[PDB]
UniProtKB/Swiss-Prot annotation, chain B:
It comes from the Bacteria. It is found in: Cell outer membrane. Disruption phenotype: Insertion mutants are hypoinvasive in the HEp-2 cell assay. Component of the type III secretion system (T3SS), also called injectisome, which is used to inject bacterial effector proteins into eukaryotic host cells. Forms a ring-shaped multimeric structure with an apparent central pore in the outer membrane. This is SPI-1 type 3 secretion system secretin.
Amino acid sequence: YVDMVVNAATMMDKQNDGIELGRQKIGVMRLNNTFVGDRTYNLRDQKMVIP
Amino acid sequence: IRVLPRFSADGQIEMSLDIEDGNDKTPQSDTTTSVDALPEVGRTLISTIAR
């Protein structure tokens, strides 16, 4: 009984080891009060840009 | 006019604005007899953001 139990358990353990459980997700977020992209202003003769 | 509009959840519109206006400099209009000149406006440049 003891030997069967220990063997079966140790085989089950290495068999299930390929299961992948860590996963990535995508979150969408709208800005309400500002422009999302890097922002250009044109001065009289020149563009200048803010991150 | 050059413009870029944005909707804000408060029911407000935000615009990036470039405005240029005026009339062409004309030394050639040498005449005195036309004191009834077409009205001399200036020339003006503005760039800004407003909400």
